[PDB]
Design a protein around this ligand. Structure first.
Ligand code: ADP
Ligand code: ADP
Ligand code: ADP
Lengths: 427, 435, 86, 417
């Protein structure tokens, strides 16, 4: 519950209507109807997943809400669909090539819902009488509507001895493997032992004696390749990034078995999204790889964001729009974000204030909207926070003009920093 | 060993109750607006409401940016963690730059985890009161309870524990006369060792005899452990327990610091939230002071202005000393403070003016005081004058050598002659430029 | 029932031995005389007393050493059950 | 007899010859000239010895061959941990510049740790269930527990063995039997060497001081410690294990007196080759509490800083120049040159005539000083070839004609291959 509000916490989805009509202000967003409708339609395409290898480029001036609309789409997509957010400079690893990192990122945003039929027996253990030789045992499971006694085997008795199960424990035994899983207790333990005090759990299902076809959908991403590349996979799946596995017999074989599962009804493919923020940091080799990697059937939807116009492509000398080669730039379609006006700026500032739980006068809102239209929006939020803190220190109830104007001089913007920078501190 | 560091006089921002700035601000002098901004941002940190916020301590060299940084750090107190980092440390040959930055961000975040355990200890006097066989079945011999006579230094208290634990008692060498470590819920017995009262001087053995427990048998030990999120990340990263990990050749290369985002985020964050909302731990976000931020590559700034966008990112205090300079890793891309113009928009710039000659004199005097050497009025005036001529940091470095010269010359206080001689024996770079 | 529950009497707290030559907490045990001691002088005096004893049937007198205020017993009857050195 | 260390490039200087009042003499401990630089070296040496402050750096400037490295070696010999390195040593393939520089900084600091433990040692007479430990002045019987019984068997302890056992059941069989060696006429085991029986009280407490540098982070780095202490060791050196554990433990030991730190000196010869990253790291590293006294040497004036196109004095950033006390050396004169040549000849066991010394000084003034320092031994060997007892002008002239100098070498490069 203790998680602080970040720069994109004010947004909590992409405000859209039944007909995908964008709204002025909803779900923490304001203005920018065109790019928001583009986000809505690409999100509909993602949730459809019928087509693979689609790319979208979010372009615009800084502070136009590129990362904002990206996080909004991520939120609107909701759980059950992977959304791999990554920065352009994260692919540069000292233990795995750029192409390998891109393959990892692509396969990481693809999920397979594996269906598994289970048969679990549950109930209340009324009698767990076990005859230890130092071989024979019987279990008396009880439910709210029926009871049954089961003769326990040697291995089952040993498993029960492993996980201590006293009378009155709510357990869920899997008839397939016999794994002992304790859920709780139905009553106290004799009220006499001067220890082991806990709370009592609710009774089990009436038909819990034998659940026939308990369906559990195990969801896992296509990053499962780490499970095969090495005999010990947890080390690679948890921390180790040195996963330069062999592409042959791993990628192709896993894809083939995933197709077999999809055809045989075991699992279903759920393509996610790969959001590369500041994609301009990718080397030209990474762009050349994305050009081809984006053509596979397992290719997720590649959302990218650029904050530049004509700029040199990293790893070469010639320039291209958005710092992306002409090929990949032409392949994808671009979503331009128009700057926000004064009203939109004021509304965004008000939404941020509401998020931060801070209140300020109308004149404060006006002067702060002015300052934000002049300097920037993020700087306006910084001033919101600073003025709220100055007001709290001042013992006031709401932020007045005298606090925003004070924190404006206390904290400087880059435009004024460079102005006072004429002291030639260093070069 | 006091081991006075370069600048240890700073003890805090020294702001008045009203939040304004004063001269004798707990060691640090001057820099009114800068110290007020430091107070505002430390109040922010204490609030623990905002995350991923960065501040830039831009200012010419010698303005004491690191000084005020350590001041605000001390003001925060040892309670919240403070991880100092320099831009050069990001360049690692084994782990990528962005992952080092993320590890530093994690270190900057603290987490106090409490743990209360009810345990019983004392000299055991085992005895099983015979009880009629299970009344539900036939007859014979059974045991319905097992009484353990735990004897502690304060007294004795018999515990009628559950009979199922008898297996644990027989498992370990729990004989009458030894100290056992009982657990309330688990019940597992862990023998600490025999009592020292039986440790005859003629018995040769160690780690087997332990003193009697002091206090009541029932002890509710409350312990708190403060570990940063990076500590938990590292702990959950590497394995432990068998699995042929004892190998030397193929395993001694422990530096596998490489880390993935799935483990870093996700499960760890969820378990932390579970411990928080359950009452087992309390999150404590700290601060990440990054001096020489201009030394970072553009591949580092492009990841910084994305990590700062996360809700979990802690407060970062950048301190750039250079001016308009080409960004590292870029082809003649000049930007203010050596930082891309895109990141400067996300940081609050705290400007620090140059110290007034009077402030130079105050700094020299307080540094001499901290060093513990008396300086005459004329010597202090000469030190202030030379600190006005050249860089101020040169004067403070002339105290200890001048002090030793004075002590060797037979005098206690640093006379003007001593500083005059040291200025000719040692000089600054501005004068050394005359090649 | 007996195996899993060896109901034995308490460990019978041992004796706090003391050096007979200096009356301090005994730190060692002379092998040949089988009497505790704490210093090298005590060991030498104990060896001399044992030699005097084994010389005849039984030493009529008793060696005296470091007699405190109260009458020191000069303990001869501190029987050493150990036999000859070798 | 020839040994590992012998007459070298800086062996003539036995130390930083100075008076009680830090008054540099003309030439006492082999070193001559550079009076102001010598007094500065003495002042910084007294500062190091005091250990009252931390994070102080001194830059030794001057033209090539002005005795900068000589003054540094003299201070090191007069100075007790000392770590001398070069700008290229910190550059490691498996360790980043920052990691190597931090390792050097921590290795430049010493730490003394006092250890006091109870020890029981004596010749074993016979075992069993019980031990019969004998010493020169007494003998004692000890009852053996399960752990002691297991240790008596895992290690083949037997009669006559001079055993040693402290607390924590840490038994040791340091060496074998004393008298029984007789019947082992022909063969004697590798580990079964013999020792004299101990004396005194059987059980005795021994206080020993362990001297280790602050670089012990490698010891607490991995599961195995002694292995990494010989070769490069670990490369990671996680910041946590370094600061949150070792520094706090050293502080606690200082508080309780268990340990005491002794700040040494870190001499980085030819610091001009360092990268801007190393300088930026030093800017902060010199601000830490447990920071040693740093010494540097550079022959560069207005030169480019490696890693960037910027130029600054001494080839290093201005940010660091404001943190160093520059001690510039002065080129030697005729008298100083002749005196250092005399000292070199006396140290190398070379005898030369007055005219030979005059010609050698004239050469060392027209050319570099090291050239004449080498001509000394060259003419000595020429005289030995001629079987003469003293080196004359003819020998030094023949050598000057045989071995060329930088100036004459460049002048004779007209061939251009
Ligand atoms: N539509 C919007 N609604 C609310 N805040 C916005 C919007 N657009 C931009 N911002 C704010 O501007 C700052 C930077 O803009 P961002 O959302 O990152 O877009 P961009 O990626 O173009 O900078 C952020 O702090 C963000 O909160
Ligand atoms: N206001 C001040 N009062 C006292 N000492 C100061 C002050 N400002 C700077 N100093 C001194 O300046 C020295 C270093 O300053 P620092 O924080 O490193 O600035 P920079 O990093 O820009 O060089 C410190 O040793 C400190 O003693
Ligand atoms: N004052 C001096 N006393 C003794 N030897 C000296 C003196 N000055 C220079 N030398 C000799 O000069 C030689 C080379 O000088 P060097 O230390 O390389 O100069 P730099 O300090 O510029 O590196 C050394 O072998 C040293 O013996």
């Amino acid at each position: 519950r203790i998680e602080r509000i970040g720069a994109h916490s004010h947004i909590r989805g992409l405000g859209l209507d039944d007909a995908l009509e964008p709204r002025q202000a909803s779900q923490g967003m304001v203005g920018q109807l065109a790019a928001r409708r583009a986000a809505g339609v690409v999100l509909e395409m993602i949730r459809e997943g019928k087509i693979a290898g689609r790319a979208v480029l979010i372009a615009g001036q800084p502070g136009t809400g590129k990362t904002a609309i990206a996080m909004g789409m991520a939120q609107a997509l909701g759980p059950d669909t992977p959304f791999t957010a990554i920065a352009g400079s994260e692919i540069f690893s000292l233990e795995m090539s750029k192409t390998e990192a891109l393959t990892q990122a692509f396969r990481r945003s693809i999920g397979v819902r594996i269906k598994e039929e289970t048969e679990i027996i549950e109930g209340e253990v009324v009698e767990i009488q076990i005859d230890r030789p130092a071989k024979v045992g019987k279990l008396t499971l009880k439910t709210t509507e029926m009871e049954t006694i089961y003769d326990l085997g040697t291995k089952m008795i040993e498993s029960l001895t492993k996980d201590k199960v006293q009378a009155g424990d709510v357990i869920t035994i899997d008839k397939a493997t016999g794994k002992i899983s304790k859920l709780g207790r139905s009553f106290t333990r004799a009220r006499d032992y001067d220890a082991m005090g806990s709370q009592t759990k609710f009774v089990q299902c009436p038909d819990g004696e034998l659940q026939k076809r308990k369906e559990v959908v195990h969801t896992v991403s296509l990053h499962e390749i780490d499970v095969i590349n090495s005999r010990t996979q947890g080390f690679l799946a948890l921390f180790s990034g040195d996963t330069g596995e062999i592409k042959s017999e791993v990628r192709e074989q896993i894809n083939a078995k995933v197709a077999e599962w999809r055809e045989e009804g075991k699992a279903e493919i759920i393509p996610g999204v790969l959001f590369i923020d500041e994609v301009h940091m990718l080397d030209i080799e990474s762009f050349s790889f994305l050009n081809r990697a984006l053509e596979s059937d397992m290719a997720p939807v590649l959302i990218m964001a650029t904050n530049r116009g004509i700029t040199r492509i990293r790893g070469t000398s010639y320039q291209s729009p958005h710092g992306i080669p002409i090929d990949l730039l032409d392949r994808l379609l671009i979503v331009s974000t128009t700057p926000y006006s004064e009203k939109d700026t004021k509304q965004i500032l008000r939404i941020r204030c509401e998020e931060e739980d801070v209140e300020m006068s109308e004149d404060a809102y006006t002067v702060l909207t002015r300052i934000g239209l002049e300097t920037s929006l993020r700087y306006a939020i910084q001033l919101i926070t600073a003025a709220s803190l100055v007001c709290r220190k001042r013992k006031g109830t709401e932020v007045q003009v005298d606090d925003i104007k004070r924190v404006y001089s206390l904290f400087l913007d880059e435009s004024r920093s460079t102005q006072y920078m004429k002291e030639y501190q260093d070069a | 060993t006091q081991r006075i560091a370069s600048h240890s006089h700073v003890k805090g921002l020294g702001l008045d109750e009203s939040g304004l700035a004063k001269q004798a601000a707990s060691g640090l002098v001057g820099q009114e607006n800068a110290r007020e901004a430091c107070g505002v941002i430390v109040e922010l940190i204490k609030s623990k409401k905002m995350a991923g916020r960065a501040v830039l301590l831009a200012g010419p060299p010698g303005t004491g940016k690191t000084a005020l940084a350590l001041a605000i750090a001390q003001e925060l107190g040892s309670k919240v963690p403070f991880c100092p980092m320099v831009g050069s440390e990001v360049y690692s040959t084994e782990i990528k730059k962005t992952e080092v930055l993320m590890e530093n961000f994690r270190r900057a975040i603290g987490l106090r985890i409490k743990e209360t355990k009810e345990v019983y200890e004392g000299e055991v006097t085992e005895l099983t009161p015979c009880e009629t066989e299970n009344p539900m079945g036939g007859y014979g011999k059974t045991i319905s309870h097992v009484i353990i006579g735990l004897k502690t230094a304060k007294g004795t208290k018999q515990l009628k524990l559950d009979p199922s634990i008898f297996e644990s008692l027989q498992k370990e060498r729990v004989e009458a006369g030894d100290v056992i470590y009982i657990e309330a819920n688990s019940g597992a017995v862990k023998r600490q060792g025999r009592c020292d009262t039986y440790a005859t001087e003629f018995d040769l053995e160690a780690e087997e005899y332990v003193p009697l427990p002091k206090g009541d048998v029932h002890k509710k030990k409350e312990i708190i452990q403060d570990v940063t999120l990076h500590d938990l990340d590292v702990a959950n990263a590497r394995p432990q327990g068998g699995q042929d990990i004892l190998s030397m050749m193929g395993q001694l290369m422990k530096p596998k610091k490489t880390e993935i985002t799935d483990k870093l985020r996700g499960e760890i964050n969820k378990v932390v939230n579970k411990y928080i909302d359950q009452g087992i731990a309390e999150l404590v976000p700290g601060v990440l002071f990054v001096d020489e931020v201009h030394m970072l590559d553009i591949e580092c700034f492009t990841y910084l202005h994305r990590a700062l966008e996360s809700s979990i990112a802690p407060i970062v205090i950048f301190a750039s000393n250079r001016g308009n300079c080409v960004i590292r890793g870029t082809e003649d891309i000049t930007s203010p403070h050596g930082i891309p113009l895109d990141l400067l928009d996300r940081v609050m710039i705290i400007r620090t003016m140059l110290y007034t000659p009077q402030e130079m004199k105050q700094i020299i005097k307080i540094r001499a005081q901290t060093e513990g050497i008396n300086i005459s009025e004329e010597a202090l005036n000469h030190l202030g004058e030379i600190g006005t001529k050249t860089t101020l940091r040169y004067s403070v470095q002339l105290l200890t050598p001048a002090n030793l010269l004075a002590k060797i010359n037979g005098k206690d206080s640093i006379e003007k002659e001593h500083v005059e001689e040291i200025s000719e024996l040692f000089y600054d770079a501005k004068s050394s430029a005359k090649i | 029932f007996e195996e899993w529950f060896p109901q034995g009497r308490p460990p019978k707290v041992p004796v706090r031995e003391v050096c007979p030559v200096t009356h301090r907490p005994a730190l060692y045990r002379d092998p040949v005389t089988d009497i505790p001691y704490a210093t090298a002088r005590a060991f030498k005096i104990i060896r001399e007393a044992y030699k005097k004893y084994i010389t005849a049937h039984g030493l009529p007198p008793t060696a005296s050493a470091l007699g405190p205020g109260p009458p020191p017993p000069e303990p001869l009857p501190g029987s050493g059950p150990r036999a000859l050195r070798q």
